[PDB]
Amino acid sequence: FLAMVDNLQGDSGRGYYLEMLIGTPPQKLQILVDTGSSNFAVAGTPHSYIDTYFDTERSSTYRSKGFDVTVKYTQGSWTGFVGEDLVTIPKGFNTSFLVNIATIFESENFFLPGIKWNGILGLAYATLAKPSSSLETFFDSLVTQANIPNVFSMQMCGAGGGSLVLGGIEPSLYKGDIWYTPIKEEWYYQIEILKLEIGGQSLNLDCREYNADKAIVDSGTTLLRLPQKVFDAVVEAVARASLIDGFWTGSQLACWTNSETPWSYFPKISIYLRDENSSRSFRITILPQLYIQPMMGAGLNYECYRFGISPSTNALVIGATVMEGFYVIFDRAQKRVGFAASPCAEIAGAAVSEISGPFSTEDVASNCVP
Amino acid sequence: LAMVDNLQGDSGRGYYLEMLIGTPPQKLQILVDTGSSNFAVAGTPHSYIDTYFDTERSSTYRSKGFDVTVKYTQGSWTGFVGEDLVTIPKGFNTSFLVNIATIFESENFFLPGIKWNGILGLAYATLAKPSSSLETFFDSLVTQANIPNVFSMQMCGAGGGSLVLGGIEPSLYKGDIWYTPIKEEWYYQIEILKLEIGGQSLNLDCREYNADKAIVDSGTTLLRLPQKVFDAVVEAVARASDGFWTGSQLACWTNSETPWSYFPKISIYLRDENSSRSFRITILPQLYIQPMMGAGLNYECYRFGISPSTNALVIGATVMEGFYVIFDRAQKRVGFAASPCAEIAGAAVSEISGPFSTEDVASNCVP
Amino acid sequence: QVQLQESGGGLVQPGGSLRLSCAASGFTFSSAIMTWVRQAPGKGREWVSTIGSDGSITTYADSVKGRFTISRDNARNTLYLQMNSLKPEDTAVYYCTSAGRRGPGTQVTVSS
Amino acid sequence: QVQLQESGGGLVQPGGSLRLSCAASGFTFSSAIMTWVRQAPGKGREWVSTIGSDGSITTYADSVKGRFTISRDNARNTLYLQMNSLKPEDTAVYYCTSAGRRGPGTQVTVSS
Ligand SMILES: CCOc1ccc(C(=O)Nc2ccc(F)c([C@@]3(C)N=C(N)OCC3(F)F)c2)nc1
Ligand SMILES: CCOc1ccc(C(=O)Nc2ccc(F)c([C@@]3(C)N=C(N)OCC3(F)F)c2)nc1
Structure with missing residues (x-):
């Protein structure tokens, strides 16, 4: 264990x-x-x-x-x-x-x-x-x-190995609290996304855009994959908050020197999820280090970077771009996905994700899933 | 040896x-x-x-x-x-x-x-x-x-090297060595007559290449080109096949997207010691469309291995790694030869041939 | 789609002997791994024995080894558990399971 | 603009002595590494001796060792070469040199 x-x-x-x-x-x-x-x-x-x-x-x-x-x-x-x-x-x-x-x-x-x-x-x-x-x-x-028990948990430690715990949760893999959200259906690990926000501001979108037809926690998918319309509205918001075209489509990488410190300029990406007690929600956040992803690793005075988010046709896939930020508990027995702040998820001491709650589930449907 | x-x-x-x-x-x-x-x-x-x-x-x-x-x-x-x-x-x-x-x-x-x-x-x-x-x-x-007052160097970095101080070593090259005159003893300044992209000449007066000098520099990574020349070269290259050009971005292609086979050769014509003649050195996409990650995946991301300069055409690493280059200060001249250690997989990444007539060009291309 | 019904349980004295059956319908039984687990009142779910699809590979919990024998008759869509040398500590609901599904259970109860 | 002029060359018998001098004008002589090289008719240049800027580091070709002494007098912008135990094979033109540039040279001749 x-x-x-x-x-x-x-x-x-x-x-x-x-x-x-x-x-x-x-x-x-x-x-x-x-x-x-x-x-x-x-x-x-x-x-x-x-x-x-x-x-x-x-x-x-x-x-x-x-x-x-x-x-x-x-x-x-x-x-x-x-x-x-x-x-x-x-x-x-x-x-x-x-x-x-x-x-x-x-x-x-x-x-x-x-x-x-x-x-x-x-x-x-x-x-x-x-x-x-x-x-x-x-x-x-x-x-x-x-x-x-009918639970496993996973912690990914390669932002910038990992632990896979079969049969429970190991406390030395997280810090703070575990927040859980309901599994909506038992095929994929399907959960309900309530709200996306870029840099403190919300995207003009219905909560049902997000779960089309399914938001899933997938360890076997590299990037955060967003339905085309969500993808487009995320990109427009990220660009506005800073520096940047083929970079968005994954067909080019932008290179910046060290001291042009790329990460300082992009915004946080926050995903709001329904708590088990439904009147509430919590917020899992990633920062620029996880989604503006260094690709060379040669320790020279520059780096070239991939945008670690990509369009999907009909799936919102919370893959490694987001999972790298948290300890994630696949609690099948209780039909819920837990997330906690992960110690190993910091680059040069700084944490590259955050988790916070609770917030109120007004201003969004009783139910955001098809 | x-x-x-x-x-x-x-x-x-x-x-x-x-x-x-x-x-x-x-x-x-x-x-x-x-x-x-x-x-x-x-x-x-x-x-x-x-x-x-x-x-x-x-x-x-x-x-x-x-x-x-x-x-x-x-x-x-x-x-x-x-x-x-x-x-x-x-x-x-x-x-x-x-x-x-x-x-x-x-x-x-x-x-x-x-x-x-x-x-x-x-x-x-x-x-x-x-x-x-x-x-x-x-x-x-x-x-x-x-x-002797001669040295010569071979870079095997494409896809270490040799610096021979006081002569030339036969095993470092194959074929003939061609010599172009040193025009001025400061940098290693040489006289470029013509740039060809994928076998088409640029529309440029030959003096554009030698404003204000063309030099051979193992201390510069990229082939660096005066802005006007670099504008022709980008246009010509992009025709024959935007951040990429400026070196701001890398282009990623999968390996079955086979990106080297869809870019042209770049040729540089230099005067022979016999002034009525020239030879050409040529690089292929391999040398100027450079794989950046070497991570052994099914896709690579590349930078354009040419860059603009203000005051010089700099024949840097990215041309030099194609050839064995002799700096023959004694007889005032720079030798180029095909370099056996310039092969990827066993594929040549560079070419040398000649002679061609210089009827077509002025008798001095340096202003 | 896994449907299963166990029976054969009952009340026996220590040293007693039962044969539990598990009948399956609706999924490919002759190609499924099959397992027995038991569950005492407010004790843990306790794995008993697993059998590969053709019967040749059987594994067993230490606690039942040498006493219980798992087996199946693919041609009759049925799993078995031969339970000998029964002692009071064997008291429990016996469930057959496959692919995340289980039957209602059979009550096995050993007392003097 | 390295400008140099050698002298004190001449004709001597085997076993004899000469002191060559090299006068510098228009460069930073008192800061310059300075060298003597020699060339007999139609043979390649042969390095003789090098001296560092303050005189303390001197180096010599095997062929002249213990026989020639290189020295300099910075305040006079002059390089010297004391040459003892001359032999026919020291016959050559001697030239002082620095930073690529040499003087016209001085002719030393050692014959019977
Ligand atoms: C940490 C994430 O990094 C990764 C890098 C590569 C890979 C990887 O190869 N995934 C991978 C490869 C083949 C494949 F078939 C799959 C399947 C079955 N699983 C998922 N979820 O989506 C695609 C898929 F249905 F096909 C995944 N995964 C993760
Ligand atoms: C083989 C190419 O790879 C290389 C990578 C780095 C370098 C490199 O640093 N060159 C380098 C670094 C500092 C520097 F000061 C110089 C100087 C004096 N020499 C040249 N010709 O150009 C610039 C310069 F005048 F400043 C060169 N060179 C080659």
Whole structure:
């Protein structure tokens, strides 16, 4: 449990991943933590941009279900044999649990170059598992077989590794209070966004623009992804508050010298969320360090920077641009997502996010979700 | 085959030479600059360097009793001027007495993430500060070691290097060396006749290239172009294929967006020693559309490796890393040759060919 | 869509013996992992035993090892738990579970 | 504007002695590293000796060591070369040098 502290490697750019031991004798793989899907899938054959894969023929305990699954996504896909084997987690657990696994033998645009993970642990709900919700997820297997609570928490520590805590909340990963918001639906970790504000001022938008058709906490998405219309109204407000075009679309990076200190000039971005006691809301904030994102890291007198927010067609995705700011509690048992100020989320001593509350839920619907 | 790979560094943070100064010897790392003429090293600690030359620990150091300040656009350095024995471990048995300036006060000189803590000006006497009578390092070395008055350098930074002091090393090039005359002994000033973009000439009088000088400078990262020339070059380049141009922004492209294959060659024509003839040096997109992150992802972000200047066409790193370049002060000339270590993946990133007739151009392109 | 009904529970004396069944309908039982968990009055949810889809891989809680045997008959959409050497501490509701779903339970009660 | 003029060259027998002088005008001689180089007919220049600005650091080509003494008299803007135990192979033109620039030279001849 406190053994789970610092169990993830990686960053907010290339993803955070967990070591996992699979089969008998154990094969050691690097599995991305992804709260936006629900399958457990690993490389099953050598690939160009991976070092190692799970060989099912060297596992004495592997058994095949005799069918295979394909998962499609916007750019790319992955097909895999569905089977079952024993897994252990070196950081957290003394024993082993019998889980479903998809061994990928064919994919398009799945394993990309300079990526250190060779598989993916979907930690969302049964409903988004392929090929059907009746394929037990890893987290429902572990919860059941290890007698832990139906809660996990995650802390990302690469703004400017991480801890993934399976079966509770570890106090030394946060400071202050945990504020919780309701899970609105159990497929993605869907929550209700009430209000966005840039630099102390609100965007002229209905609260339902934000949750179109869903605001989700996704560890398997790099950026804060906003529906096109929200995206456009955020950009217009950020530009107005300071310095800046292709920079907004992710097709160019703006370079500034050290002393032109870029961060001083952009505004805070605050996301208002409904408290469990509905008359109230709280506010999670990120500052410029998380969303104006240094890309070179060479420690020269300049840096070039990506805008870590991007348009989505129909999804508001609270990915790593925001999650890096907080400790995040996926409390499935109580149907709620917690957020707390994260100690590791400060660049040169300064905190790069904030959390605050409570505020009143007047001036916004009883309910902001379709 | 002695001074072959004696340089460290890269086409962005500079190529530097290892040097031992004083008695007992102190080891410094000194940037090779063919566009200035002082030998200057950090003399005190400074927050962005690991070491410096402490003149009080050298029993052979003598002070001249005066200092110097040198200004450039964005900064300056001030140093005490003295004299001490130096050796270049990769290249030389004995030590030679040279002038050294010890920097105790500078601005914007040592910068974060630099690996060198001194500068070796290999240009001519005329540019030495505080006057041309401050014997330059290469004039000392030439005189005291009995070598020919020639050096040559190969940068392998594209995608270390060699500085050969007193000649030319066959293994550092392939094909023929072409020589263009040195027009004036100050900078290494040479006579550009024609710029071609993706095989089309710019509409420019050849004097535009040599206002007010065209020079070869291992101390400048970018190919730097007078504004008028740089306006033609951007327009021509962007035709053949805005923050990017100014170096304000980087352009990111995925690797199947294959961005190098959609930009033109840039050719620079220089006069042969035979004045009725010229040869051309050419760079490809690889050299002037530069990958900035080297993070090994499925996309790269790039800066344009050309920049405007006010008073000079500076043939900096980004052309030099294409070729082996011979600075043959003896016969007043600069040699260029294709450089084998200029290949990405095994792909050539540069070209040399000739001769072509100079009928088409004036007989002197320098105003 | 996981529907399940356990039975076979009842009241037995220590050293007693029961066979619990779990019948499934509506999902692909013969391709699902299946597990038994028990739950005493105000004690914790306690995992009992898990069986892979074809029956060859069974794992067990220390507390029931050597006493209980998990097994399934894929052709009849049914899971089993052979419960021997029953002692009062085994008293509880036994639930079969798969993919986050469970049956209503069967009451097993061991007393002298 | 480095301006230099050598003298004291002449014809001597093997075993003999000469003192060369080099007079400087129009540059900062009392601040200059100063060098002597020599050239016999159609052979390359041969470095002889270098002296630092105050006279305390002097260096010598192996070929002249213990036989020639370099020195300077700053207040007179003059470089010297004391040359003892001359031999036929010291026959050459001698030139004083600094910062790229040399004087016309002085002819030394050592013959039977
Ligand atoms: C810290 C965030 O940084 C990251 C960097 C890369 C990645 C990454 O590769 N994610 C990733 C790769 C393939 C993939 F298929 C997925 C899926 C299943 N998960 C989510 N949520 O959205 C896209 C997706 F449905 F396809 C994610 N993730 C996070
Ligand atoms: C190979 C290119 O990479 C490089 C990176 C940095 C540098 C570099 O710093 N050059 C550099 C730094 C300070 C400086 F003072 C100088 C001087 C004297 N020399 C030249 N020619 O131009 C500017 C200058 F007159 F000021 C050069 N050079 C090359």
